[PDB]
Design an enzyme around this catalytic site. Sequence first.
Site, PDB file in Angstrom:
ATOM      1  N   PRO B   1      11.875  35.629  51.675  1.00 57.93           N
ATOM      2  CA  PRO B   1      10.459  35.290  51.859  1.00 57.93           C
ATOM      3  C   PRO B   1       9.601  36.535  52.062  1.00 57.93           C
ATOM      4  CG  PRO B   1      11.826  33.827  53.156  1.00 57.93           C
ATOM      5  CD  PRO B   1      12.753  34.851  52.567  1.00 57.93           C
ATOM      6  N   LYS B  32      15.690  31.089  56.328  1.00 55.60           N
ATOM      7  CA  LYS B  32      16.265  32.208  55.566  1.00 55.60           C
ATOM      8  C   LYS B  32      16.567  33.300  56.600  1.00 55.60           C
ATOM      9  N   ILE B  64      11.659  31.804  47.370  1.00 55.74           N
ATOM     10  CA  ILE B  64      12.401  31.104  46.325  1.00 55.74           C
ATOM     11  C   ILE B  64      12.783  29.742  46.941  1.00 55.74           C
ATOM     12  CG2 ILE B  64      14.471  31.123  44.832  1.00 55.74           C
ATOM     13  CD1 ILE B  64      14.447  34.294  45.205  1.00 55.74           C
ATOM     14  N   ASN B  97      -2.114  31.377  50.329  1.00 55.02           N
ATOM     15  CA  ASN B  97      -1.618  30.879  49.092  1.00 55.02           C
ATOM     16  C   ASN B  97      -0.062  30.872  49.161  1.00 55.02           C
ATOM     17  OD1 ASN B  97      -4.264  32.604  47.165  1.00 55.02           O
ATOM     18  ND2 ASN B  97      -4.053  30.457  47.802  1.00 55.02           N
TER      19      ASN B  97
END
Lengths: 114, 114, 113
Positions: B1, B32, B64, B97
């Site tokens: 991330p 993660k 991801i 975003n």
Amino acid sequence: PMFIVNTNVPRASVPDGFLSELTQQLAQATGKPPQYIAVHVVPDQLMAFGGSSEPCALCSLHSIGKIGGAQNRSYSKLLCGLLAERLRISPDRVYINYYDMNAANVGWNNSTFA
Amino acid sequence: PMFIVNTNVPRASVPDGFLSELTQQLAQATGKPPQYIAVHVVPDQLMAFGGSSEPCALCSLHSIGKIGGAQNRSYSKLLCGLLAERLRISPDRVYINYYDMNAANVGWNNSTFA
Amino acid sequence: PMFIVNTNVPRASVPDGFLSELTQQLAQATGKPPQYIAVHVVPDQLMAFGGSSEPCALCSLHSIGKIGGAQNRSYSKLLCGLLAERLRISPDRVYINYYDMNAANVGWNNSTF
């Protein structure tokens, strides 16, 4: 193609030739003439990678095409190589996000490439 | 991330420990491992939100997977909370975003995650 | 809508009122209320376009909708015009990347749209 590097390496450690080298190497890698290539390098950033403040880079490569599974594996070798040699960044402290842009979504010279 | 914050709040207002706190909170939120989390904070920016130069932030979170309707609501609560508590930015002057990246489009250490 | 411009033009060359102007013009162009427009201008950048260090800009416009073939042509004319008139950047030394964001992927005010 456009390539952006954000890094915590200080400004005085970015060689004066680094933007031109990236430009030339990215032209070769993408097959695009160097006149099309844009490069942007942002040093002195406040950043961490894995919770450490050792040298690291967060990068992006946007292109209209010339992006894909195999091509991106190759770019990552090329660009890790350049950041390791010129900015002394460990390749495991580099992320590069790849963006395959639609020509309708890239503006240039008062219009888009579509 | 990868989490990036651009803000007009001055550098002196960013607490020591903010990047570690973001790393730790994001590891918990995303599940993660913290070793792979990158964080980047860019203060002192020339910005306006709604035409006003009061404190604001423009952010992005790339991952991801682990991106989606309900998860992004949760991240926004988390990250707006941190920006309000630590940087004194009102949540309604923050955009974040979210990007669900294809593993083939994230380069790292001479390859991609694919 | 959020508009970001990174440029090698110096900060002293960004005229007073530029961020207000961008806010106002982008509200007209997108049809969104100015209260929700965000603008970010980053001068003094280390950059090259075609291997030249002459004035140039790399930009992005993100919007939930109002992105598409004709609309993006219109934004590019508007924004390249403003960078040329206000910052003295030639239009052929500007790239603008357009992103049509899904509402579920834009956070604001402790939630998403």
